[PDB]
Design a protein around this ligand. Structure first.
Ligand SMILES: Cc1cc(Cn2c(N3CCNCC3)nc3c(N4CCC[C@H]4CN)cc(Cl)cc32)cc(C)c1F
Ligand SMILES: Nc1nc2c(ncn2[C@@H]2O[C@H](COP(=O)(O)OP(=O)(O)NP(=O)(O)O)[C@@H](O)[C@H]2O)c(=O)[nH]1
Ligand SMILES: [Cl-]
Ligand SMILES: [Cl-]
Ligand SMILES: [Cl-]
Ligand SMILES: [Cl-]
Ligand SMILES: [Mg+2]
Ligand code: NA
Lengths: 167, 469, 166
């Protein structure tokens, strides 16, 4: 029936990456979660008037299993590359995540978005202009999100779906 | 009627339940949220024991109460005032008679003694299963030793004296089986010739057995203190989660070793034998319920350097393609078949830890620390119960030992495995991918030929065990 | 996976905890640390069916004797343990049997009679006397050693079969 998009979230650990998918798939208006629940990572949405099913893989917490990255990434059609705006190292990691995705997918043009995540009130160290410049150099969109207010979360996932649809 | 209670002014744990201090989930009640005072009251409740709650609380409480404060609170819980003589007792005493003290005796038997025993049970579980609090805070240990060592009165004496001894044993701190383990199996490498040990010269059965013993020991060593609070993801992860990280780094090294064995075997026929041997090891991992091992192999075969080796794939026997495909199917649909298989097998097993880590992290990130109700902040205990359900599952699979004999030299070989050498991760995984491109170039570049590198027979001895008398 | 709630009861020192830890961990505990209340879980395949055993290990010391109703209400089946070198622990069995029946208001509660410490030569309770008692209850009698593992799986898994067939 409706199209299912397999999305994969990648990025450094320990800096709130998991809040992106939790806030999306959540009961938006009840701050609660059981990730063990079958299809706590599947969500039917309407994007530009077209209903589809998002299947989101977020292996947050498994970052030390670095030799499993290919196994996980191979499942995906589009990728959210996430860094924290108060963690410069996580921003510097983005280049290698993108290179690894290109290699797994055997393509120079994989649907992907760059996401800068605000995970606390600690001082921002990556300015939006730096991240915009990086995204432009890659030819991909940039979305900033809050890990607390849900701002930007729908835009991040919907923009990625549009990237897949327009590939 | 119900027993009367001490005045809440002299004993804080007699406040009536209300929605301002405790909320229950919709045959003992299940607590959704409460003040720390109410959680401790129910932890040590006079009407029933709740051993699951004791484990849940002691596993997770540091997110809402410091260890020093917990000890102060359970000592306060323990010190229960006794009621004054009743009117009937008074009249007896005024006549020179001994009072019946019926209400006092009932309160001792049905309130004080169960609450005090359940406080001691918390202390006992705390010392036996969560002793790290005391290893990290010597003053906390002194306070516990003093509290236990000064409990008076004969009703508690057996357990006070026992807990005192348990503490002293923990400060200075054997398996029996239904049958004998199978005989250790040898192939080209012979016992004591560690210099020849390699993927194809050790027996594939014994490779799988010794890796399973190693991976089982690594799995069994991970304590809940390495998991609660998501501490393995934070800046102090090497301090707080060392056994978990050792376990993960072993898994990563084995996956990279499999990839390295494959792509450094440049001759096609030899590389087919290497891959075939790895899938035989995977078969034995499956037989042993070593799911960590299964996924180590699957991760290697799905890696970018190995996945693209179509000429190697073409020569793998159909039956072995099927073994690998069914192993990969365990991971599909967010590990649906893996989860069902783990829950159906007969242990011992070695679970894949990664799923637990993601579920603990998302449970802690996706639920609030407190619930606000009637102007009060209540501890969200349901969130902690969910974390402790995961740590309890982990612990349940840590109990059963494998009935397999250690081979000390093979064990040392796999403990010391270091496929990356002195190279950094990026340089090494780039090296593996460039080797893949060398041995099977991208179309339309022609496929080169390469000389053999192994001087010994490539034929596998197979994975069915042998048994001499 | 069906879940089974088993409860281990009997006089102080007969080996309830040692039996349970032998089942769970394949280890024999030499120390005598009196229990207040402990609980264990074990996934195991019995007669081709996977289940999850929840095992409650209870206090045998008489000072805890007023706190039993609460665990008897929750248990599905009971291992009633005595030690074959302690006649008093065998005489205490009938008190546990009667209390379980009262609390569960049932004459038909899944139970197994367990005579533990069968590795010791100096027996004071003869098998026949225990078997006669078990027959009078309608339940099996299994002799065990937490030290050697003799009969340990048989005792616990027979109780599971009793609950299954109940
Ligand atoms: C046996 C073997 C397998 C692979 C690599 N590989 C391939 N390849 C597709 C591209 N052509 C090459 C083969 N498919 C899979 C696979 N899929 C899951 C569903 C079914 C199958 C379809 N993708 C799972 C896993 Cl884990 C490894 C897979 C490389 C070498 C060297 C091998 F010897
Ligand atoms: N020889 C032998 N000793 C045993 C056996 N089972 C238990 N013991 C010993 O008997 C003592 C009491 O065991 P324990 O398991 O603590 O008994 P318990 O019934 O749980 N006691 P409590 O009711 O106080 O909790 C320990 O020293 C233990 O090693 C057995 O099968 N054989
Ligand atoms: Cl839209
Ligand atoms: Cl996910
Ligand atoms: Cl190596
Ligand atoms: Cl357990
Ligand atoms: Mg005991
Ligand atoms: Na920074």
């Amino acid at each position: 029936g409706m199209t299912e998009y397999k999305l994969v979230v990648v990025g450094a650990g320990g800096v709130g990456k998991s809040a992106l998918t939790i806030q999306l798939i959540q009961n938006h208006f009840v701050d609660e979660y059981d990730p063990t629940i079958e299809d706590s990572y599947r969500k039917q949405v309407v994007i530009d008037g077209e209903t589809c099913l998002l299947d989101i893989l977020d292996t947050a917490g498994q970052e030390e299993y670095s030799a499993m990255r290919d196994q996980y990434m191979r499942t995906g059609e589009g990728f959210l590359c996430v860094f924290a705006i108060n963690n410069t190292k996580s921003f510097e990691d983005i280049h290698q995540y993108r290179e690894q995705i290109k290699r797994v997918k055997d393509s120079d043009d994989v649907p992907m978005v760059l996401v800068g995540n605000k995970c606390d009130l600690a001082a921002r160290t990556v300015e939006s202009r730096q991240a915009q410049d990086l995204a432009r150099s890659y030819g991909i969109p940039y979305i900033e999100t809050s890990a607390k207010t849900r701002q930007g979360v729908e835009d991040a996932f919907y923009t990625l779906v549009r990237e897949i649809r327009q590939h | 009627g119900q027993m009367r209670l001490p005045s809440a002014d002299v004993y804080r744990f007699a406040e009536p339940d209300s929605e301002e201090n405790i909320i229950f989930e919709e045959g003992i009640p299940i607590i959704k949220a409460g003040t720390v005072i109410k959680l401790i009251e129910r932890l040590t409740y006079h009407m029933y024991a709740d051993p699951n709650f004791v484990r849940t609380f002691l596993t997770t409480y540091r997110s809402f109460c410091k260890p020093q404060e917990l000890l102060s609170l359970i000592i306060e819980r323990f010190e229960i005032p006794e009621p004054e003589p009743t009117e009937a007792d008074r009249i007896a005493i005024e006549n020179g008679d001994q009072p019946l003290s019926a209400e006092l005796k009932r309160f001792r038997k049905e309130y004080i003694q169960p609450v005090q025993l359940r406080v001691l049970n918390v202390c006992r579980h705390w010392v036996e299963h969560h002793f790290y609090d005391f290893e990290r805070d010597a003053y906390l240990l002194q306070r516990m030793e003093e509290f236990i060592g000064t409990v008076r009165g004969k009703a508690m004496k057996k357990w006070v004296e026992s807990i005192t001894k348990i503490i002293q044993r923990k400060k200075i701190a054997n398996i029996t089986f239904q049958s004998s383990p199978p005989t250790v199996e040898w192939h080209i490498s012979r016992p004591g010739h560690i210099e020849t040990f390699d993927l194809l010269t050790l027996h594939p059965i014994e490779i799988a057995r010794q890796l399973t013993l190693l991976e089982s020991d690594l799995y069994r060593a991970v304590q809940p203190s390495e998991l609660v609070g998501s501490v393995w993801t934070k800046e102090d992860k090497e301090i707080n989660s060392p056994n978990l990280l050792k376990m993960i780094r072993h898994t990563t090294n084995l996956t990279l070793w499999f990839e390295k064995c494959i792509v450094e075997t440049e001759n096609l026929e030899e590389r087919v034998a290497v891959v075939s041997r790895i899938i035989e090891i995977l078969q034995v991992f499956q037989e042993l319920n070593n799911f960590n091992g299964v996924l180590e192999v699957v991760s290697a075969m799905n890696s970018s350097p190995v996945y693209r080796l179509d000429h190697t794939f073409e020569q793998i026997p159909s039956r072995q393609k099927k073994i690998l495909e069914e192993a990969h199917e365990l991971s599909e649909d967010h590990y649906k078949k893996y989860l069902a298989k783990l829950r159906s097998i007969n242990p011992p097993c070695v679970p894949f830890f990664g799923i637990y880590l993601t579920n603990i992290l998302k449970t802690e990130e996706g639920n609030p620390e407190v619930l606000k109700r009637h102007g009060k902040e209540l501890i969200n205990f349901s969130k902690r119960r969910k974390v402790a359900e995961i740590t309890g599952e982990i612990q349940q699979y840590q109990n059963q030992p494998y009935c397999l004999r250690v081979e000390s030299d093979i064990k040392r070989f796999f403990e010391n495995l270091n496929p990356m050498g002195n190279s950094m991760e990026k340089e090494f995984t780039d090296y593996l991918f460039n080797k893949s491109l060398e041995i099977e170039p991208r179309n339309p570049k022609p496929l080169p030929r390469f000389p053999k590198k192994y001087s010994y027979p490539l034929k596998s001895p197979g994975v069915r065990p042998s048994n001499p008398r």
